[PDB]
Amino acid sequence: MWELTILHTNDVHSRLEQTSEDSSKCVDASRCMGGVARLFTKVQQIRRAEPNVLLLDAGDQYQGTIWFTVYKGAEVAHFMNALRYDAMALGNHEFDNGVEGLIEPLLKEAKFPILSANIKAKGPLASQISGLYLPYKVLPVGDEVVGIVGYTSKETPFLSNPGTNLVFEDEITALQPEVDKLKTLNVNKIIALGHSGFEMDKLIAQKVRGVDVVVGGHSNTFLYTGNPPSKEVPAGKYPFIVTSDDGRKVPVVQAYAFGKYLGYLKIEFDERGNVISSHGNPILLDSSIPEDPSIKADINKWRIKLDDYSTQELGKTIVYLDGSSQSCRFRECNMGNLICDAMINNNLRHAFWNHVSMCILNGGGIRSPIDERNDGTITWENLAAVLPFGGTFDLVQLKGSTLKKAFEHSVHRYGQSTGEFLQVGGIHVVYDLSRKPGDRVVKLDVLCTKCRVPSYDPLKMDEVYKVILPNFLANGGDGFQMIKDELLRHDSGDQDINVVSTYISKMKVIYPAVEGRIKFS
Amino acid sequence: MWELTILHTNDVHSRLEQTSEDSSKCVDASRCMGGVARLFTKVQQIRRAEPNVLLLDAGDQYQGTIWFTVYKGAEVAHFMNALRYDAMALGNHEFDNGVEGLIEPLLKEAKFPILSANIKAKGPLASQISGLYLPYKVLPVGDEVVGIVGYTSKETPFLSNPGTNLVFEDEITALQPEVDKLKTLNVNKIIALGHSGFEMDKLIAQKVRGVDVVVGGHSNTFLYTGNPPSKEVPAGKYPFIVTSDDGRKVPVVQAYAFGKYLGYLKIEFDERGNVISSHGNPILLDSSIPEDPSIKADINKWRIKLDDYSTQELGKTIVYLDGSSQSCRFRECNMGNLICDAMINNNLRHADEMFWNHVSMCILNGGGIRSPIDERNDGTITWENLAAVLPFGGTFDLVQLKGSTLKKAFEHSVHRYGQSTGEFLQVGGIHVVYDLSRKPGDRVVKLDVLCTKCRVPSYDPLKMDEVYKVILPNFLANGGDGFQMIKDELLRHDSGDQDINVVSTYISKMKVIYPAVEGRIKFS
Ligand SMILES: O=P(O)(O)COC[C@H]1O[C@@H](n2cnc3c(NC4CCCC4)nc(Cl)nc32)[C@H](O)[C@@H]1O
Ligand SMILES: O=P(O)(O)COC[C@H]1O[C@@H](n2cnc3c(NC4CCCC4)nc(Cl)nc32)[C@H](O)[C@@H]1O
Ligand SMILES: [Zn+2]
Ligand SMILES: [Zn+2]
Ligand SMILES: [Zn+2]
Ligand SMILES: [Zn+2]
Known part of the structure; x- marks a missing residue:
């Protein structure tokens, strides 16, 4: 015994x-x-x-x-x-x-x-x-x-x-x-x-x-x-x-x-x-x-070396920045929206063509939430937990088919805490998980660039779109072989942390929300 | 003859x-x-x-x-x-x-x-x-x-x-x-x-x-x-x-x-x-x-007196700021969204205590949007450009409303729809769905509002018995454009800042703006 x-x-x-x-x-x-x-x-x-x-x-x-x-x-x-x-x-x-x-x-x-x-x-x-x-x-x-x-x-x-x-x-x-x-x-x-x-x-x-x-x-x-x-x-x-x-x-x-x-x-x-x-x-x-x-x-x-990072505040959040895996890998999460917005804002600050209206981001890449309870305050240390990796936010060029393919992948093995599930910037997706895998996207509307007034139009399988995504994904990470395979252009952006750290320093006070970018039937 | x-x-x-x-x-x-x-x-x-x-x-x-x-x-x-x-x-x-x-x-x-x-x-x-x-x-x-x-x-x-x-x-x-x-x-x-x-x-x-x-x-x-x-x-x-x-x-x-x-x-x-x-x-x-x-x-x-206004640029727009009556009084318009966002941003920059002092909602009569702004001139936006959009000299006031009063205003918003009537509201942090087939006063089929009494803001169905904190123009607060229910059934009213200054400082903040038509207002 x-x-x-x-x-x-x-x-x-x-x-x-x-x-x-x-x-x-x-x-x-x-x-x-x-x-x-x-x-x-x-x-x-x-x-x-x-x-x-x-x-x-x-x-x-x-x-x-x-x-x-x-x-x-x-x-x-x-x-x-x-x-x-x-x-x-x-x-x-x-x-x-x-x-x-x-x-x-x-x-x-x-x-x-x-x-x-x-x-x-x-x-x-x-x-x-x-x-x-x-x-x-x-x-x-x-x-x-x-x-x-x-x-x-x-x-x-x-x-x-x-x-x-x-x-x-x-x-x-x-x-x-x-x-x-x-x-x-x-x-x-x-x-x-x-x-x-x-x-x-x-x-x-x-x-x-x-x-x-x-x-x-x-x-x-x-x-x-x-x-x-x-x-x-x-x-x-x-x-x-x-x-x-x-x-x-x-x-x-x-x-x-x-x-x-x-x-x-x-x-x-x-x-x-x-x-x-x-x-x-x-x-x-x-x-x-x-x-x-x-x-x-x-x-x-060992904390003396780390002290000279949390020193400066890059901004304040009036809302709880939910960067949890239980949220960001199952449905729309406000940290996803915040990051995707910072990426678009990064590009569109220095920009029909050259304009980017779309952003995709693997939920598993969101590695921590941020609490708002401490005077709203956000430091480098707070961000370094959300984005520890050290990647970049890269600019890709994709067919409507390749973007459809990635979104069908996004929910292929849904309900497994799989980090492939995408958070989006300037995209309106609707999933019906009742449907067999690979035919689960029932709606996909994307923000236009080749328009004077930006509005969401149904995604066209034969059109070409300019998405901001992490280098991990551009490189076919998270099974998105179709991105690395079928991409029509790839120009490498700036350091993930610095991109979001620029934007928080800009906005001063942030409040991202769950506004229906990702939906379910 | x-x-x-x-x-x-x-x-x-x-x-x-x-x-x-x-x-x-x-x-x-x-x-x-x-x-x-x-x-x-x-x-x-x-x-x-x-x-x-x-x-x-x-x-x-x-x-x-x-x-x-x-x-x-x-x-x-x-x-x-x-x-x-x-x-x-x-x-x-x-x-x-x-x-x-x-x-x-x-x-x-x-x-x-x-x-x-x-x-x-x-x-x-x-x-x-x-x-x-x-x-x-x-x-x-x-x-x-x-x-x-x-x-x-x-x-x-x-x-x-x-x-x-x-x-x-x-x-x-x-x-x-x-x-x-x-x-x-x-x-x-x-x-x-x-x-x-x-x-x-x-x-x-x-x-x-x-x-x-x-x-x-x-x-x-x-x-x-x-x-x-x-x-x-x-x-x-x-x-x-x-x-x-x-x-x-x-x-x-x-x-x-x-x-x-x-x-x-x-x-x-x-x-x-x-x-x-x-x-x-x-x-x-x-x-x-x-x-x-x-x-x-x-x-x-006569243009010499006016010259000392357009002098300073307040920001740049990469998109056409559609403030047209043909857009802003019939459906969702990017100028409405831009303004409504600047109002919320004005309040939420100087807020937070708990779930109170917070505002997640904004309503604005489309007729109050008096001009569009063209992006074709280097993106550039001056005081003169804004003074045409918001000429009146009003303020963006903070009101407190029942779910019923907010429902009432939204039913009013499309009561005589298709007449270029300015009562039609543009919204900030609100998701409305209209079905104009229905008789007037029962045309709102969906109304979801952004929550404050939540750590993560999400859109929840509007509750007829709850109390909401909306940012709206003084004209609307004082029951302008037929919104008698706002003036009559409001549960609090605190007066905000000058309409132009509210949107100017936001443009001065954002530096480069790009509002869009993202489905805040919809139709069935
Ligand atoms: O703790 P784990 O074993 O990772 C459990 O979570 C699995 C998910 O995590 C996501 N994921 C994992 N590693 C990465 C990474 N790493 C690169 C930067 C440093 C090495 C390569 N970069 C990125 Cl954006 N995402 C990564 C990926 O979405 C997985 O589905
Ligand atoms: O403008 P008209 O050619 O007469 C015909 O259009 C009528 C619409 O215009 C809108 N509207 C009219 N007056 C106002 C005003 N005025 C106040 C400030 C100055 C005095 C009262 N303040 C405001 Cl936010 N909006 C005003 C309103 O939306 C009307 O339905
Ligand atoms: Zn692992
Ligand atoms: Zn792990
Ligand atoms: Zn008149
Ligand atoms: Zn007139």
């Missing part, structure tokens, strides 16, 4: 300090959630009360706040070491700053194993990266041993910068042999830890034989059994039980994201290394759990 | 200089229309060729451009005298600057009769206005005599400032006694000249017995027989023939407005003073009719 307590975080996304419950900057400290210093308290309490504890991360500690912008990963390595994480699987964002941006800050500093069984190194890189990351690590858990096989999304080269010499294999194909190797080493307790999303995690559990528990992330999935503690509605019960093809019940877990919740799963194992019981729930990390003084004091030492 | 040539203008609205064909400021002089110096050339050219000519004005020479803002009527009196107008009926706008603003500049200075048979002076006013205007004037036309009875819109006190000591009678009731009086003076040739609109003009012709011809204005009606010379689509043939209740065919005329066209109607009269033939058409004052050098030279003398 050997009991294992699995504690896990996924998609912390540079959320080192305690946050608001929407995961934005903390204002009212007493009503603030998350943090690393608050995580350390709960982890330590659990480690006291429980004999066999593992602390894991399913990737995406990289990218999100001014913490990563400045420390570029050093903060992940330093604080994950203080919290004494047992393992961490590689996420797509760990490659955002290139392989040198992963090797030097994280791989070379992390005093704990970093894992991925489907990333295959090629060329001279292989002998450089030797043992910096591993397909698995066999860990001593008291008087027993626990093997943990890692995995990273096949999609990392289309979401990040992992370079031309890392091969991203299919997870199931790359996992099953490593599991069988651990099996022939008599490792009876196998955990799959990785960054591919809940739907992938469900199949890893179903297909990869020998896996006792699947720990995941990427899809920012919140799972809960009972009455949730906050605003997150669960996708399913915690853990999610997958009846695998070999006849076992495989528990699948995820801890939402941004370090708001600490995943907690108690596992009963037999002498043979099989699951008998699998129960728990994610602990909401809040005010009712103090921040450890030593970690908090240390967090404050 | 005694022939009369009637030449007429109506609703010139301070358009002294030549204009663009949308009646906005002239840029490319060679492709510019109208003005007083072009008018003088064609008038003089007709007076030579024709023996019995009359030049008339059916009111509204007052209000419109920087000309009236500065000269306050003196420019009307000076230039109408130079053009040697035979008569002029009183329009509603002649009262915009009060009765002292009519007596001192126009009535005393005008070397020609000014008329209105339904305005009745009373008390201390009566005395200070004796013979300054008259119900009619009998005019010698060659070897014959022509009587002209004037008339002014019953709703001048709800459209202008004529004061409390002037009584606006029902036109037909006040007109007949004068026509029947003139008849007993053996005045066989009677013209009705007034400012009440085409639909009133049609009834004056129908009901007022003895009227031979009705000359009008107010409704900026363009009438034409054949292929029009410009962008104005005609309401009907010129002249419009009204088969009167006494058995006669009464020609009804109107010359559009802003001095763009000169009305021209040739009339054949018998020994008895009746119409036999009534034919003509409005002459478009275009590039092809030269400006008279003496009038143009004199116009230039």
